[PDB]
Design a binder for this molecule. Structure first.
Ligand SMILES: Nc1ncnc2c1ncn2[C@@H]1O[C@H](COP(=O)(O)OP(=O)(O)NP(=O)(O)O)[C@@H](O)[C@H]1O
Ligand SMILES: [Mg+2]
Length: 545
């Protein structure tokens, strides 16, 4: 949601009185402070502190460049950085921010109109921009909301269908009277004054005009007072709440960073009749490897379908069976054939010809650990957090599908691109028979469960957060087993935020029953991730180009 949602002292959209109340009840001490959302400005806040037993409310606007600042004060990249700053320097206020009035018990910020407005746009943005639906849309959103908002805040209004770049009041008027004179028909036209446009809309068969003024901060204003960062937000806002408007806005009067939804993010089946076994004649295989591992080798190739030719990855040699146990293998495959989720390497089908081949979705970016080695200066942490979050989305999926992985590890997290990771080889592990990814009970009692995987995710997090470093480097066999029992876990990676190491730690509880399940893991990894996805950027083609 809000880039202040993680802040333990942020209360969301509470009133000025509610605010004072929480402070009153906290000790009215000098330095007591809380943060909240400005009911009148989109993306803005209000710093509320106590000094000499009296309340002080400072509004915090969001400049057109993304920083936050109290009028006359310094600019800050975010609520977090702002509060961290004034805590060590009054720089204008009655006194430094000292004891924070953290939210009581288990209360969360009070979601308001801007939070609701924000989701709606993102939602209708992906649905719109990539015609996605169902969980697929839900999966796109949950993971890319951070990136989608940025897009929404940079999309030019000149783009929107309701904007008319060269219209006069008289014309717009006759353009609105020219057709379906329905309540809510509207358009926007820029007025002469720099940063001024007019909202022209129909109500009761009559056209109404509303000046839209732009202030010094650039924020767009409605006669009523509410401010927005762009017209589009203002428009969607008036679409729900119609303050100052004679009627809610309705129908319109018409006239770099690779995201995850390009290429097969969605299942290959978008009109089916898919069988488990494929025809070797529909499969084109190369004799050139993409690497190999414990099981067979991986070769690239293409697969032709009734209407499409897709690119695949063939893991030649699954292993092959010697007895009527080729049925058991086929049992698993049957199940895997069902698993469908963007963050997982889907199984297209199996084919038995010169060998027992496993055909999967193409994920050519390579393993997560190879992609991160030596790139600590290239790939920002927020970017790694994003991948670890995608990794838990597939894991939470696989867990609710009662399908244990058994081999979660970096080597098994495959990248489609910089911001798209897929989990692979989920199942082939249990086909036959450096492996410090297993939980203690996997080695101690042959026990495998989603809880067992949550441990491997813990290890994977480490592998990634420490940019491709081998787990428990100075060890191998039992040395680890021992190391574990003695209550020792791996150290917190350099430049790895506390919340992650905290999550990672909970992932390494010896009693699997105490370890979080992926549902909880995924919630936590998201909150962490979202908050990290604010601090601008670092390295490569990020001129926001
Ligand atoms: N679906 C795929 N698309 C593209 N490359 C793949 C795919 N699956 C595997 N690879 C490549 O093969 C390598 C991984 O080898 P693989 O045979 O999958 O096992 P591994 O991760 O080395 N170990 P393990 O699964 O534990 O036996 C990676 O470096 C990938 O580049
Ligand atoms: Mg693998």
């Amino acid at each position: 949601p809000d880039p202040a949602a993680h802040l333990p002292f942020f209360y969301g959209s509470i009133s000025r009185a509610e605010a004072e109340e929480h402070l009153k009840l906290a000790g009215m001490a000098d330095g007591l402070f809380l943060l909240r959302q400005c009911l009148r400005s989109l993306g803005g806040y209000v710093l509320s502190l106590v000094h000499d037993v009296r309340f002080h409310h400072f509004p915090i606007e969001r400049q057109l460049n993304g920083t936050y600042a109290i009028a006359g004060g310094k600019a800050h990249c975010g609520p977090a950085e702002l509060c961290e700053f004034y805590s060590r320097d009054p720089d204008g206020l009655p006194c430094n921010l000292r004891k924070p009035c953290n939210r009581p018990s288990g209360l969360e910020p009070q979601p308001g109109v801007f939070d609701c407005l924000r989701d709606a746009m993102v939602r209708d943005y992906v649905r719109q921009t990539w015609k996605l639906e169902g969980e697929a849309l839900e999966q796109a959103i949950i993971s890319q909301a951070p990136q989608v908002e940025k897009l929404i805040a940079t999309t030019a209004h000149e783009r929107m269908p309701w904007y008319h770049s060269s219209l006069t009041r008289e014309e717009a008027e006759r353009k609105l009277y020219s057709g379906a004179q329905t309540d809510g028909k509207f358009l926007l036209r820029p007025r002469k004054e720099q940063g001024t446009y007019a909202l022209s809309l129909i109500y009761g068969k009559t056209v109404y005009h509303y000046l839209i003024s732009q202030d010094k901060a650039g924020k767009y204003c409605i006669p009523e007072g509410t401010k927005f960062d762009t017209l589009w937000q203002l428009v969607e806002y008036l679409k729900l709440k119609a303050d100052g408007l004679i009627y809610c806005l309705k129908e319109a009067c018409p006239n770099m960073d690779t995201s995850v939804f390009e290429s097969p993010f969605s299942d290959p089946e978008e009109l089916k009749d898919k069988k488990l076994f494929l025809k070797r004649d529909n499969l084109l295989i190369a004799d050139i490897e993409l690497g190999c591992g414990n099981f067979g080798s991986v070769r690239q190739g293409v697969y032709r379908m009734r209407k499409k030719q897709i690119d695949v990855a063939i893991k030649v040699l699954k292993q092959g069976t010697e007895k009527a146990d080729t049925e058991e293998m086929m049992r698993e495959a049957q199940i895997m054939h069902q698993l469908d989720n963007p963050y997982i390497v889907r199984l297209i089908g199996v084919c038995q010809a010169e060998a027992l081949m496993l055909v999967m979705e193409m994920a050519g970016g390579g393993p997560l650990h190879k992609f991160l080695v030596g790139k600590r200066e290239e790939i920002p942490v927020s970017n790694v957090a994003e991948l670890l979050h995608q990794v838990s989305m597939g894991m939470k999926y696989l867990e609710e599908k009662n399908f244990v992985h058994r081999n979660l590890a970096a080597r098994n997290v495959l990248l489609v691109n910089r911001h798209y990771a897929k989990i692979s080889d989920f199942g082939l592990s249990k086909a036959l028979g450096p492996l410090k990814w297993y939980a203690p009970e996997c080695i101690n009692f042959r026990k495998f469960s989603s809880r067992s995987d949550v441990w491997s995710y813990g290890v994977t997090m480490w592998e990634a957060l420490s940019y491709g470093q081998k787990p428990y480097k100075k060890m191998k066999g039992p040395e680890v087993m021992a190391f574990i029992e003695q209550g020792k876990r791996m150290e917190c990676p350099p430049e790895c935020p506390p919340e992650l190491y905290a999550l990672m730690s909970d992932c390494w509880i010896y009693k699997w029953e105490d370890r979080p399940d992926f549902l909880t893991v995924e919630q936590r990894m998201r909150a962490c991730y979202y908050s990290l996805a604010s601090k601008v950027e670092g390295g490569s083609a990020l001129e926001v180009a």
